[PDB]
């Protein structure tokens with residue numbers, strides 16, 4: 001009987017691996033690893049990880065000007 | 066734009082609104098829309114006068130995109146420079162443009178056309194006895210050219226190596242130069258009697274390309290762009306046959322040279338005696354007064370060291386004054402040094418043949434002053450619907466890289482990162498299922514892979530033949546012939562070596578696993594292997610082109626950037642997120658974690674004469 | 681060389697017609713596009729082992 005407020009992030013291994021590096025750089029990102037498709041993250045960093053991840057993925061996307 | 070009220074939504078547009086001008090009463094008939102700022106021209110393919118402008122627009126405007134209904138052209142200095150050559154003056158362009166335009170031509174557009182359309186046709190370059198003379202038909206030009214700081218009826222000599230300098234200078238100065246050869250009145254150069262045999266059939270587009278070149282009556286040096294497999298070889302063959310003078314052919318391959326010669330004899334009536342082949346195997350040169358030499362640029366652009374047999378050949382090429390030079394695959398002549406053959410080899414006319422007139426650097430524009438402007442271009446989809454070329458069901462398979470490999474992808478450096486996601490297990494399983502499914506359908510499959518290590522691993526794992534740089538000419542030729550007519554061998558594993566200029570009339574399916582980063586030409590060149598399929602007219606036939614790319618990787622950046630040219634031509638890639646029936650396949654490579662772990666480490670680990678008896 | 685002839689009766693004529701029909705269907709299948717190219721496969725689960 002114990003409750004822990006947080007955000008349940010559901011994603012694929014590719015996104016999961018990216019989140020780990022973000023968690024590695026910023027420890028507070030991930031609170032606990034639930035499963036290969038479920039991660040617990042701090043609510044405060046949700047607005048930042050989603051926005052920060054966009055810049056990282058921008059490199060993999062070819063935008064013609 | 067005077068006393069025109071902007072619309073409430075005009076703020077969204079930025080200096081591009083063209084509603085200030087009014088439409089003519091005959092809009093229902095005129096097919097052309099002209100952009101007064103960007104120079105883009107939108108052509109109606111479903112309205113009267115569409116055909117009359119389809120060919121004219123290509124000459125004056127470079128085609129950007131030509132989809133089914135609405136074609137998109139654009140007028141530029143290079144495009145106008147190509148049109149101004151073939152008997153076209155500024156008045157003709159403006160008169161035709163206004164006649165076919167729903168809207169009046171703006172002053173700004175006119176000013177741009179006036180500046181560059183009057184330059185062509187005042188200075189001529191001629192060659193005599195291997196000596197280059199800058200000939201002008203008026204004496205006024207002497208006060209201009211001779212007084213130029215860079216430089217140094219009247220005709221004066223000029224250094225052969227200095228042609229590339231003056232020609233570029235000629236572009237900067239008002240008057241550019243034109244390379245016209247009056248072969249009719251040229252009797253000093255020996256002639257060769259060769260004509261196309263009766264079995265030959267000139268296709269309608271081939272005749273149109275020739276007409277644009279011989280419209281005025283004097284041969285013009287330039288570039289011809291045709292779809293891969295459309296017959297760019299025959300284009301060069303026709304030019305040599307009609308000129309009827311000494312000619313030299315450069316082909317950037319060894320297999321191509323062998324097949325170029327075989328097709329050369331088949332289509333024309335040239336006797337084998339007068340035809341000579343200059344490749345690594347044999348280097349003998351024809352002793353006849355007039356003959357043809359088919360070689361590769363690497364065999365003529367070398368400067369430091371050459372063989373004794375090749376040393377005489379180099380002098381043999383340089384000493385004689387050739388009449389025509391055919392630059393096969395002219396997309397590589399503006400490279401570092403292959404352009405030397407154009408200068409060292411003396412020729413009164415130069416021609417360029419390439420399907421893709423694009424490259425990463427800006428040297429593509431150098432072709433304008435190297436061999437001339439672009440003469441004719443042909444659509445891809447238009448020939449597809451006419452039965453000239455086969456239809457392709459282009460596809461792009463997104464294979465999500467496995468988690469174990471993806472972890473190393475993040476940490477690994479860029480140089481080693483490429484090999485990691487090219488050998489992911491998912492690609493192996495997808496390829497196996499597709500190969501078995503397509504093999505059951507009686508289709509010939511070609512698997513391209515720029516990485517030699519991946520090619521060998523895939524080939525040995527699947528027990529199929531593979532060809533790459535180390536493969537000798539003899540062995541590969543046997544493999545190619547076997548793959549064409551042998552039913553047992555239905556698939557092969559080619560590499561960057563076979564990316565272009567190899568004739569595969571039987572190939573129908575094409576797959577690629579690796580790539581040479583963002584090049585947009587290799588994608589088109591590779592696709593050309595299946596565009597010349599023999600059974601391209603049977604009802605319902607559609608070729609296949611599969612691109613295996615790892616998802617959530619840099620491959621998408623290169624994949625979306627390396628297929629932009631084909632999209633412009635008309636090909637459309639279809640995303641395949643799922644391959645149905647993959648699970649039901651009996652066995653798949655690296656299906657268990659144990660094999661994946663073993664592969665992970667394997668790829669990761671990749672980075673006194675009497676004393677003579679003594680020994 | 682050897683010359684072989686075959687006299688076709690009414691039953692054979694109809695029998696031969698069906699052979700071509702089967703061949704035509706196979707010929708059409710040889711040119712028909714694969715199933716996955718027929719329908720857009722986005723909602724379906726992603727490809728995998």
Ligand SMILES: Nc1ncnc2c1ncn2[C@@H]1O[C@H](COP(=O)(O)OP(=O)(O)O)[C@@H](O)[C@H]1O
Pocket residue numbers: 266267268291292293294295296297298299328566568570593597
């Ligand atoms: N007029 C033609 N008649 C028959 N086959 C032709 C004709 N023009 C081209 N081909 C065939 O097209 C194929 C490709 O020719 P090739 O000159 O290698 O094309 P490209 O250089 O444009 O890639 C060859 O099989 C060639 O025989």
Ligand code: BEF
Pocket residue numbers: 292293294297394419420565566567593
């Ligand atoms: F465009 Be081809 F294949 F030389």
Ligand SMILES: [Mg+2]
Pocket residue numbers: 297298393394566
């Ligand atoms: Mg070719």
